[PDB]
Amino acid sequence: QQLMMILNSASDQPSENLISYFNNCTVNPKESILKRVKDIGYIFKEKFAKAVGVEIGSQRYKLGVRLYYRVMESMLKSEEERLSIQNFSKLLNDNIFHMSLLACALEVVMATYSDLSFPWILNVLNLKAFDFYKVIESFIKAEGNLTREMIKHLERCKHRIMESLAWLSDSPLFDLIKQSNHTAADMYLEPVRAKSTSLSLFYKKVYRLAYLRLNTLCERLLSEHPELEHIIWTLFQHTLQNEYELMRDRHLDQIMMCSMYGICKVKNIDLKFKIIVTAYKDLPHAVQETFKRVLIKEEEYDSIIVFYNSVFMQRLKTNILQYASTRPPTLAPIPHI
């Protein structure tokens, strides 16, 4: 609420201190920013009215712009001490950065006055999910006045990217994988020419997420053999690392479910899919469609079992059978607290 009243009384264009920073740039970007704001405003108002039968669409967008500008300033204030004069100015003239900061401010506004739910704004601004991921944490950390529910929303936005949206085809994440600290500005200053801080942070966070979800379902379902959780994590984590094609257009929680059934299957452990798959519904934001509609190949979808036997097993039979031999694979590290 407080932030929402700083914005209503605030201004639709940059503070003077924010312009101080524009005056610290070699290529004064301010011209480019104002143009970006207006051209985006045009596309935003269209797609806005296009879905809800302007007046509201214009006012949503201006609050975002006030939030966009407030956070940029705060963000630039940390980045003074971190970036060279050259990197500072490259940031302020970087399209994908500014697109992502504004898209994140706008999502805040949209979801406060809340389907139009995320990722609508990323389809509005044609902004790749993986690009947007780079801004979220630094955004939360640059706006001390986000409410709890709202932080929860950005984090939910963040987690859906980690679990699916970054794994969509044509998503740049796959281009970054093939070639194989951590502020939003660091990740946007990455070039598009051939190690990626962006990929390293994403995979690191994904592993902590993916494991914590594994841990929950393993304690409920594998308390009879607490020995299986670390083995299942090994299959899961090996799969995310070296068989990353399996995640393409699929869901992190789908790979988690196959791994637990797979490991229990080669351990001759009686734990059927539906026994765990019913337990997955009891995860916080879980959906039934996650195990009811699973991609096989060329746009053909089916249950998770059809995915298990017809795609998952076909691709991992060589790895999975090592876990029951006299020379099982070495166990993968647990992601750090």
Numbering used by the authors: 383 to 435, 439 to 499, 511 to 576, 599 to 612, 643 to 785
The authors write:
For E554K and E533K, we sought to understand the structural basis for large reductions in RbP-E2F1TD binding as well as substantial decreases in thermostability. The significance of E554 in Rb-E2FTD binding was initially pointed out by the authors of the two RbP-E2FTD structures as forming an H-bond the phenolic hydroxyl of conserved tyrosine in E2F1TD and E2F2TD. The structure of the cancer-associated variant, E554K, reveals how the lysine substitution disrupts the potential for these interactions by forming a shared salt bridge with E533 and E551. Remarkably, the crystal structure of E533K shows something similar in which the mutated lysine sidechain creates a salt bridge triad with E554 and E551 in a manner that occludes the Y411(E2F1TD)-binding pocket. Together, the variant structures of E533K and E554K reveal a structural basis for the disruption of E2FTD binding. However, from these structures alone, it is not clear how the mutations induce fold destabilization. In the structures of RbP-E2F2TD RbP-E2F1TD, both E554 and E533 form A/B subdomain-spanning salt bridges to K653. It is possible that the loss of the salt bridge interactions contributes to the large destabilization effects observed for these variants. Within the cyclin fold of subdomain A, the greatest destabilizing effects (ΔTm) are caused by E554K (−7.0 ± 0.5 °C), E533K (−6.4 ± 0.5 °C), E492Q (−5.4 ± 0.8 °C), A490V (−5.1 ± 0.6 °C), K462E (−5.0 ± 0.5 °C), E539D (−4.9 ± 0.5 °C), A490T (−4.7 ± 1.0 °C), and A488V (−4.1 ± 0.6 °C).
The retinoblastoma tumor suppressor (Rb) is a multifunctional protein that primarily regulates the cell cycle but also has roles in cellular differentiation, DNA damage response, and apoptosis. Essential functions of Rb occur through its pocket domain, which is necessary for regulating binding interactions with E2F transcription factors and transcription repressors that bind via an LxCxE motif. The pocket domain is the most highly conserved region of the multidomain protein, as well as the most frequent site of mutations. Protein X-ray crystallography of four missense variants reveals how mutations destabilize the protein fold and inhibit E2FTD or LxCxE binding.
